[PDB]
């Protein structure tokens, strides 16, 4: 439905149509906590500390100070809520910058910004004015023709689309246009190639509307004066918003691993409590309450400290990412999953924006005996300047390059600009202009040049034109010169098709083979000289062959083959290139060397995809490069079967429809094939299919899938991907406004993954190691005391020492791990292989958690038993035993932190000593009610030395042995 009339003031919004601000907002305040709380409190490693601190609801379970349980619970809750709210408001602030762009309007008022622009308010978009919503172009810049919009940031196609103003709206003028014109459009739907509706005028006047009559979403107007359009859809009705899935919160692999080991740790301490209660036997005979009490005692430190440490180390990780000057302006969007980087194994990359700047130029031109590079412009320049032995080759090559195309230049000011249907033509004409034979004027029935040096202006009359078309790959024109009465035909197209029409060309195959190896978009050009009457003979034949209503249109092809394109002289071939992002062709090599199966997923065409892939070293110097294009229906399984037969070592290049079919019916079989390949490339992939592939890879292989992109083409992938990165590109930011991370170019990803991610993961792993170690050591010490004296475990370290060990005395060196560096900043590039060592669960598997358990058990057992050996269990010596136990326990952590530190930074060497000397100011100063004997005699410190020596010698020796081996 949707009858839209200008003069929408009576129903201006008024809930009749949505507003145009596409905010990336989360958690409306009326449902902020009800969502965040129920989200974070479902994982066991959080529910554990919640259930611990929610004890003391029954008085029988009061293990100690209510402060020890409520305080840290509130601390973690408030810190998590604050971080989440800060991230949300920061995203809203950053998004506000693009929501209220300023758009000149014609209905009323001065220019009003977006979020005030709504259905049907005419926008006089200018030049590079990013379109705000879905438009219907009612009037162009008055060329009596069309206007161009480039889809660089909507579907990724690198070629500008053709859009034509509606036929009846070029004459109405503003007065009748505003008053009552009316239009209608179909209800919003997916896809970026369909449209339906009608324009309307007084009485029954009506005309059809088609995809070429509309400008969509963030498509950017290109190379034109201005145009008048009335928005049709807006507010999540755009073709950009409709093709994008709802955002979902994501969780880190490190969080999952810590949950999986916290399950085991809870089971372990529950088993220890059961053992203690059953061993004692006579503990009140209400053994269930006693095992519950012991469980609550043993669980008071580990999980609640783990959440604090992780959530306050994520802040350091995010600050380090956001602050580094080697990756400047890489502001992070999602504070969570900063450590997930470092365990990435797949990387689905976009082509347009991330890889190619969509800038193009004639890198090199070859025309037979020699070749000319862009740097050697001087020779061709002085050759062409004399246009008005090899001169007859080069001059005519350039004179044909400057005339055989579809470009149309226009002047907005003293400078000219190019409106053309393809960057290939744009670059060809730009090269001609640079070498001095600039195109200066264009129109039906006339093509002209402006000549440098001599200042002459050349005028040619195009007699017929054969536009570029798919499955033809040839474009040519018949040119009638009038400076000299000569007729010409000049043709341009793909070598694979033209090579059958060119002269002997004994060198063309060799040159093309050595040309395309660099990924250049090879094109060949030829000519033929005609006369006046022969053109008339051709026209008679072509006019007859153009008979309408007859199903013999191939007569025209036969005529052109007979007369025009049979023996074209070979002027030469030209190599157009895609300007890759800085340092891409080595960054890809580094990433692949680290073990990441870098793929390519693009919305572009197959030829350009292959050319960019070959240019970027994504395909090795020699590979099969299998092609699977336009396969439909299930019967394409023979392609995958032949791929298995080919036995790997053969890159795959697949069309978007083929990928969509294979991922639709042959999910598992296709995945089992593509997994072992070194690289996959997709072409013409719609925004949904990239997200589908990203989901399927993770679902099927378990590995983690990075995704990098820019523009609304990749929002659906970045949201459904892991650690999804966005690039804030020129002329648009919508992708970075929704990505998890942001970077100004693709070169940054090398450092963002190999160094920041790896260091984050290692820091978090070792920090969790130490937290669990310092929890289990005290748990084991209390359990050993209960075993060896039959007293309740809570007797040892009773009072303020539990708080002082949970926090304060020993938090600082444990947090100090998050400032270490595994390797220098620079040495990441020289040894990319290091990142591969994390490919397996080498840091948080049960096989390592149990080793930590054994080491903590030994440490605590030695501590407690040797304290008892150097003291007595009698209550007379309790205040001495507790001291020789607790001080040794604290020094245990303050020594083991220094034992497992890789590089000694200034902060660590300060904080370790500053917490040891804080403990020395601790209970030995105001703690006399516990942990106090004489504590000065030599027999005390000798025993402490012996305990510490026997405690650390195994870890020191093991570290030495396993660093020697
Ligand atoms: C509407 C919602 C309502 C909620 C409101 C809040 C309720 C109460 C708040 C808190 C409760 C208790 C928790 C206390 C901790 C607070 C932690 C935190 O929340 O995070 C905030 C900063 C982040 O840093 P900032 O302080 O914001 O300032 C930074 C900017 O973040 C940073 O962006 C700027 O640089 P770029 O990154 O942008 O380039 C920077 O200039 C500042 O503006 O948390 C932290 O500060 C985390 C700790 C920081 C790490 C410190 C050590 C590590 C760094 C480097 C190591 C190098 C070695 C040094 C050697 C020493 C030689 C002398
Ligand atoms: F090249 Be993608 F569409 F940003």
Residue numbers in the entry: 154 to 541, 561 to 1137
Q: How did the manuscript describe this experimental structure?
A:
In budding yeast, NEO1 is required for neomycin resistance and encodes a phospholipid flippase that establishes membrane asymmetry. Neo1 and Drs2 are Golgi-localized PS/PE flippases, orthologous to human ATP9A/B and ATP8A1/2, respectively, required to establish plasma membrane PS/PE asymmetry. In addition to the previously described PS and PE flippase activity, Neo1/ATP9A also functions as a PI4P flippase, transporting PI4P from the lumenal leaflet of the Golgi to the cytosolic leaflet. Here, we describe a mechanism by which the P4-ATPase Neo1 in budding yeast and the orthologous ATP9A in human cells confer neomycin resistance by preventing PI4P secretion to the extracellular leaflet of the plasma membrane.
The cryo-EM structure of Neo1 in the E2P state with bound PI4P provides further insight into substrate selection and transport mechanisms by P4-ATPases. We observed a lipid-like EM density that fits well with a modelled PI4P. Interestingly, the lipid entry site is closed, similar to the closed entry site observed in the Neo1 E2P structure previously determined in detergents. The headgroup of PI4P resides in a large cavity next to TM4, with the terminal phosphate forming hydrogen bonds with a pair of histidine residues (His472 and His476) (Neo1-PI4P). Glu475 forms two hydrogen bonds with the PI4P headgroup to stabilize the substrate further. Thus, the PI4P binding site in Neo1 is within the substrate translocation pathway and is on the opposite side of the membrane domain relative to the PI4P binding site in Drs2. By contrast, the PI4P binding is weaker in Neo1, perhaps evolved for facile substrate release into the membrane.
